[PDB]
Amino acid sequence: AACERALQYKLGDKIHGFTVNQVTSVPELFLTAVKLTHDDTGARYLHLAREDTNNLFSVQFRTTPMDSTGVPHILQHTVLCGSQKYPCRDPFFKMLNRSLSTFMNAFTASDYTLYPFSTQNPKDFQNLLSVYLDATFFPCLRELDFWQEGWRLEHENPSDPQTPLVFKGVVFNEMKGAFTDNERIFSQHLQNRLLPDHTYSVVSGGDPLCIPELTWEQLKQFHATHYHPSNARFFTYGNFPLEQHLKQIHEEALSKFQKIEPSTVVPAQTPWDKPREFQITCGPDKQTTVSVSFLLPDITDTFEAFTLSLLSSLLTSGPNSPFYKALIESGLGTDFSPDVGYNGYTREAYFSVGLQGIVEKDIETVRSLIDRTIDEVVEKGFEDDRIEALLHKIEIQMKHQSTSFGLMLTSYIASCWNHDGDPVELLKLGNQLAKFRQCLQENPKFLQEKVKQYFKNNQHKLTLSMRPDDKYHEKQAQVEATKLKQKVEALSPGDRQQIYEKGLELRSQQSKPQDASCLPALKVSDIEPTIPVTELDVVLTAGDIPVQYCAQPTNGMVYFRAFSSLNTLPEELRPYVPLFCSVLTKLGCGLLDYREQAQQIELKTGGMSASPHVLPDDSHMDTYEQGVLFSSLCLDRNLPDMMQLWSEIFNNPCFEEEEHFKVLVKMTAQELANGIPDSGHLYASIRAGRTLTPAGDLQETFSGMDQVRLMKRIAEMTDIKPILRKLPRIKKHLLNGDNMRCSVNATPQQMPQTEKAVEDFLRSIGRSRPVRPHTVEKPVPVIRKLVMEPTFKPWQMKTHFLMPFPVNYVGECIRTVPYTDPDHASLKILARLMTAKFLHTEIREKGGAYGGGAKLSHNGIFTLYSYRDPNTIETLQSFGKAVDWAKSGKFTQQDIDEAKLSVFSTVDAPVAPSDKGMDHFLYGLSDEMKQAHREQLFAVSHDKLLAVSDRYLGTGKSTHGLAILGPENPKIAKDPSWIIR
């Protein structure tokens, strides 16, 4: 075992230029931590040895911008554009298709940049390690790679210098879209105002109005100052041998450097003498946000950070928390303000609390309630059972097995490590918990004293309020048009000529097919021919309810799911099903009111939820399954309590709870509205697909813009009673055992108790004709009752949702073929091929959009999309040209092999013990069906790819749907084939 092998390392051991400084067992996480330092550079290393085949590498640099140009963000994009050992264009994106990685990305936080990848293949790991090391330490930083990724002046037609110069660039648009999210605007300003003295006062990602101030030389300087191994932290996780990692890191990078003292220290924020307050504005959607925030200690004091994080949870988490009762239940707002709770990304942490959706006349009342709540907590402290619930919640987080543990761990330790803290102390949760408990036993006023010290008597307090401006982005555009004009007018004739020539040069480099034989690569033969079979046992229970049991190493956790059909539900009630689902476990049950119920759920489970699903059939486009998925998890010992809760929720849910219902509705509506820009492409594609299949229509109703708008309507109702009365009607057709199947994932030793607890639940719920005339029994590989609409006819629609956004989100959906159709595998390969070889270049590289690609869903919907796109019309035109390119067959066998690697990267991604058997449980596909599909994927050839392109994607071949979220577009507005919404 990897963790055992690492215990053999001794202090003082020398390995490939590193010295072992510490070896620590962390048995609660089944791992051994090895701390090392590189001898010559002083670079810090942490290896977490654990029996996990999904290994991760990351390198972290302390990056401290002193302006809002976004230099560390733009640098992060640019280092991935070519390096000394791999000078070809775009090593990172190319490696995405030459690898079987489980994760490959890069992130820029406020004061660090982090470069992680993960994979379960050891050769692949070495390959990706060499590319990442070369990119971060020896990057090309070519002027034109920057122009592409950062910002540039470019003629609207690069080969026509009489066309106007405009701003373009990937990060430029990425950040425009990031600050389309009004919570992100608030969150950025909060940090900037609370920590105004140093690096934390600026916009590290890039303020769009500041980006064009960035120069190429500034970009290179920032790299020279921050990207030295003395300024870095190296991290590996998993069961691959440490020695090979150290050998690569030393020989390919660190051996070329000597020790420096980096000029990258982030100094302490000097505490204020008196609180401050500020007001800002932000875009339209009466709706004022206000928060109060407090500066907290240095996160490098790990136990104090741990204590304050838990304290922040006690203060703000759930309907029983003091701030929830005082602020959310007050009905003064819709939801908590952004970044509520503990914020520990910055050298000094901070706590924040407040509300959004408040009428401006209520700001002072909110501020007063915040102060009154603090005084009350100081005086009365916290309920002991809530503290037990929190410690229980942490136990669940400790025991639950995830597939991305390495990524979670490096992200969790990053900020503390950034400021020379000790990441190993962060891993010792058992110690931290025990010390926290001992601190409660020894001082009964421990938490009260902490609240008094950090909240009541703390002068470093910020009140920030934000109010919408209906012309927010318009004013930004006007300022941008202004700055553009100033730059352009300043151009000498030589400058204009340089811009023209370099623009043409960049376009050429973006167009010319290039040799990539530089990069390492796996081969298709490195893909496993078959997959391990999933073992499950289906037992008919409580008569004829099928229950699926899947024994897994869940580490003492039980995962329960029940699926209940929607086939008997009157169709008029369908749009209210998502609302029903969101409040079902939150309104109280039986003798438990909503507060008692929340406490029991927090104390006894890791969560209990219901959600509506539409599950497409594997063989027929116009057949689907519809129902509600009930999902929960708990520790072994709490299983009977969990099922008792499910029994009460199914039998006696509190549908008379009108007050709390209104709170939940307004929270849900607020959250759905806030999340639109971040998921803009998803909303576009859901709309575009809604007229293509019966399932698609239902999905729009459940989770599309229609559902967002319905929730917003409901949240504005003066009398919510007519809605509330629909809930019992829904309960009647759903909360029973008439059309149900369940699943259980647990350890084989926990299985026997679980079968009994599950049987009792099923016997405890109600028992004893589909509203659709055509229902069909589809046996598995459990009879599922599906809806088929044999007279469904797809039709084309084009919808433009007018949004006050500075960028666009575009979706085009095309009806193709279901999973078991042999052409499905070809279309799946084609989606990645088109993304990698056409769409990424046209839409992102040339266009400047943050994202552009194609994908194929299980339902057979082929979707082309863009994300944070400055274009609309040109993007739709590129979709058409992508199809023309596919039909031309102008791609190589190597391009196809790379598309396969990419697809299999996704398809063969690790599945958590809790999620095993879910493919079978939900979609009813057996291992035999998946393996057949896998073989079809392996057999996809060049001739098949051009055939399916012509057969399904060509004009007039299949039905298409289109949707756009974005601002006014004159051309679309004048086209009567477009619906404006």
b (16+ CB within 10 A) / e for 752-762: eebbebbbebb
Question: What's the closest the beta carbon of residue 146 comes to Zn ion, in angstroms?
Answer: 13
User: In the complex with Zn ion, which residue's Cβ is closer, 345 or 500?
Assistant: 345
User: In the complex with Zn ion, which residue's Cβ is closer, 204 or 565?
Assistant: 204
Crossing angle of helices 927-939 and 893-907, in 10° steps, is 160
Spatial distance between the Cα atoms of 695 and 859, rounded to a whole number of angstroms: 8
Nearest one of 204, 214, 205, 203 to 167, comparing CA atoms: 214
Spatial distance between the Cα atoms of 658 and 667, rounded to a whole number of angstroms: 14
User: In the complex with Zn ion, which residue's Cβ is closer, 204 or 465?
Assistant: 204
Question: What's the closest the beta carbon of residue 136 comes to Zn ion, in angstroms?
Answer: 16
Question: What's the closest the beta carbon of residue 123 comes to Zn ion, in angstroms?
Answer: 29
E strand or H helix at 19, and its extent?
strand 18-26
b (16+ CB within 10 A) / e for 283-313: beeebbbbbbbbbbebbbbbebbbbbbbbbb
Name which of residues 823 to 852 contact Zn ion (CB under 5 A).
Answer: none
Spatial distance between the Cα atoms of 760 and 764, rounded to a whole number of angstroms: 6
SS3 for 408? helix
User: In the complex with Zn ion, which residue's Cβ is closer, 174 or 183?
Assistant: 174
Return the bridge partners of 631, or none. 561, 609
User: In the complex with Zn ion, which residue's Cβ is closer, 171 or 797?
Assistant: 171
Spatial distance between the Cα atoms of 482 and 563, rounded to a whole number of angstroms: 57
User: In the complex with Zn ion, which residue's Cβ is closer, 174 or 700?
Assistant: 174
User: In the complex with Zn ion, which residue's Cβ is closer, 124 or 174?
Assistant: 174
Chain residue whose CB lies nearest Zn ion: 174
User: In the complex with Zn ion, which residue's Cβ is closer, 77 or 393?
Assistant: 77
Question: What's the closest the beta carbon of residue 74 comes to Zn ion, in angstroms?
Answer: 8
User: In the complex with Zn ion, which residue's Cβ is closer, 78 or 632?
Assistant: 78
Question: What's the closest the beta carbon of residue 210 comes to Zn ion, in angstroms?
Answer: 15
Backbone phi and psi for residue 256, each to the nearest 5 degrees, phi listed first: -85, 0
Question: What's the closest the beta carbon of residue 841 comes to Zn ion, in angstroms?
Answer: 18
Q: Within 13 Å of residue 207, how many CA atoms lie on the same side as its CB? A: 17
Question: What's the closest the beta carbon of residue 174 comes to Zn ion, in angstroms?
Answer: 5
User: In the complex with Zn ion, which residue's Cβ is closer, 111 or 174?
Assistant: 174
Per the listing, tokens 């890191």 go with 249
809, with CB counted inside 10 A (0-12, 13-18, 19+), is buried
User: In the complex with Zn ion, which residue's Cβ is closer, 174 or 181?
Assistant: 174
Spatial distance between the Cα atoms of 520 and 877, rounded to a whole number of angstroms: 34
Instruction: Find out whether 684 and 872 touch, Cβ atoms under 8 Å.
Output: no
Question: What's the closest the beta carbon of residue 109 comes to Zn ion, in angstroms?
Answer: 12
Question: What's the closest the beta carbon of residue 119 comes to Zn ion, in angstroms?
Answer: 22
Separation in Å, CA 239 to CA 119, 250, 281, 891: 11, 20, 50, 38
Question: What's the closest the beta carbon of residue 835 comes to Zn ion, in angstroms?
Answer: 18
Nearest one of 557, 734, 745 to 649, comparing CA atoms: 734
User: In the complex with Zn ion, which residue's Cβ is closer, 203 or 830?
Assistant: 203
Instruction: Find out whether 903 and 103 touch, Cβ atoms under 8 Å.
Output: no
- Here's the x/- map for Zn ion, 160-179, by CB under 5 A: it reads as --------------x-----
**Under 8 Å CB-to-CB from 532, ≥6 apart: which residues?**
none
Spatial distance between the Cα atoms of 292 and 458, rounded to a whole number of angstroms: 12
Name which of residues 521 to 580 contact Zn ion (CB under 5 A).
Answer: none
Spatial distance between the Cα atoms of 51 and 696, rounded to a whole number of angstroms: 42
**DSSP summary character for residue 139:** B
Number of residues near Zn ion (by CB under 5 A): 1
- Token digits of residue 107: 């992130």
Question: What's the closest the beta carbon of residue 169 comes to Zn ion, in angstroms?
Answer: 11
Enumerate binding residues for Zn ion (CB under 5 A): 174
